[PDB]
Design a protein around this ligand. Sequence first.
Ligand code: PE1
Lengths: 213, 224
Amino acid sequence: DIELTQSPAIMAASPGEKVTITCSATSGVNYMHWFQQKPGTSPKLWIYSTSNLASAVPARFSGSGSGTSYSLTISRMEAEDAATYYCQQRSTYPFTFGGGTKLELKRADAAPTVSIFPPSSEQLTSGGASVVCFLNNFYPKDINVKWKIDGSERQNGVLNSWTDQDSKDSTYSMSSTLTLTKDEYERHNSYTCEATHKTSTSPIVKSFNRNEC
Amino acid sequence: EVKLQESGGGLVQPGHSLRLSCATSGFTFTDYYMSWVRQPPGKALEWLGLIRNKANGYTKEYSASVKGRFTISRDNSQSILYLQMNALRAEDSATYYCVRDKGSYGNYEAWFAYWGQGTTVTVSSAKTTPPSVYPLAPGSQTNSMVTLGCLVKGYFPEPVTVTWNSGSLSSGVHTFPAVLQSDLYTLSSSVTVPSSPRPSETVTCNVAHPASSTKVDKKIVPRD
Ligand SMILES: Cc1ncc(COP(=O)(O)O)c(CN[C@@H](CCCCN)C(=O)O)c1O
C-alpha cells in the first residue's frame, strides 16, 4: 500500500525558469510514472518508466529517481506546461497516484475587467433576487471582492467562484453573486461591486441603481 | 482510432448501486488490460482496479478502498468495460475514467496513455433539481467590448453544460465552477462580444442539465 507524497503542493514559475517536482514513496518502487492534467480534461501520460517521455512531450522535460525518491524536471518553463502533475507507482498492487502538484504560470499584470448585473425580471417573479459581478481575465490571482449596498457592506448572501489559470491567456477570472430576497432587494437602492487588485491602489468598482422602468 | 467512452454516471442514493460502462473501439479489446480510475472534485486521481486480458484469464485486481463493494467486468463481444458499484458512500462521488492498461508486448509508452473523457458519479440523498436559467445583461455602452451572461441556479447534481449561440460563439467565454449550497448548485457563464454585434445580432446561452432532462435557452435582451 505504497503511499506517494508530492511536493511542492503548489507553485509558480516564470518563463524560461527551471522547475522541479519531487515524489517520495513510503516504500521502494522500481519505476515512477508521471501524468499532466490541465483543468477540465483527462490526465495525460507525460513520463513513463521514470525517465521516458510520452508521445509528443517536449525535450525540456525529464524525470529521474529510484527507491523512494523521484522527480520531474522542466529545463525551461513554457506557458503551456501550466497544469497539475501526478506521479504514479504501478510497482505494487494496488497502483497509486500522488497528491499532485499544481504548477502555475506567471505573466504580465492584468487588471480585472469588471461587470455587474441586476437580477432579471424573470428571477424576481420567484421572490428571489441575485446581483452578479464578473471580474474577468486578471493576473495576479489575489483578488478581494466586497459588496456595498447603499454604502453599507453586505456579507450574508455572497458566494464566489474562481476559475483556474486560463489556458488561452494565463489569466484568472472570478464571479461573485449576492443573493437576497426580492423583499430585501426592493428596500435598498444602490448596489456596488468593489474589487481590490494589485493592478490599482484605486479600488475598481462598477455599480447600478435599481430603477423602476 | 483508439476510443474510450465511459457512461452510466449520475445521481445515486447512499447504500445503493450504480453500474458504469466504457465503450471501446479502435483497437483489439481482448488483447488489453483495462483500469478504472477516479478523481473526486478538486482532489487527486485514485486507481480502483483493473481486469487483465484473455491471455491472463481475464483476472481482476482491486484497490482496498473498494474491494468487496466494486466489481469490474467486461463484454468481450461488444468491447465494453464495466464497473459494478454497490453500497455507495459520499467518498464514492467523483469522475470515473477507463484506461487501456498493458498488452501482450512491450509497448510500455502506450500503457495508461489512453483515458476516457470521464463520467460524474454523485452519491447523495439530495433530490435531483432542475436549474433556473436567468439573463445577465447590462443596464447602462461607452465600451467597445460588451460582456453578457447567464445565471444557472438551484440545480442538482452536476454537471450542467453551457454554450453560446449553439456554440458558434466560442471565444471570450468563461464558465465558472459551480458552488454548492444547501444541496443546490449555482454557476454563471460570461461571454464577451464586441459592442457592434449585440444587441444588433442576438446572443443566446444554451443550458443543458441532463441529470434532470432540462434543456433551456435564454436570449439575453438589453434593459429597456
Ligand atoms: C500498466 C501496467 N499494468 C499491469 C502491470 C503488472 O501486470 P501483472 O499484474 O500482470 O503482473 C504493470 C507493471 N508495472 C511495473 C513495471 C512496468 C515497467 C515496464 N518497463 C511498474 O510500473 O513498476 C503495469 O505497468
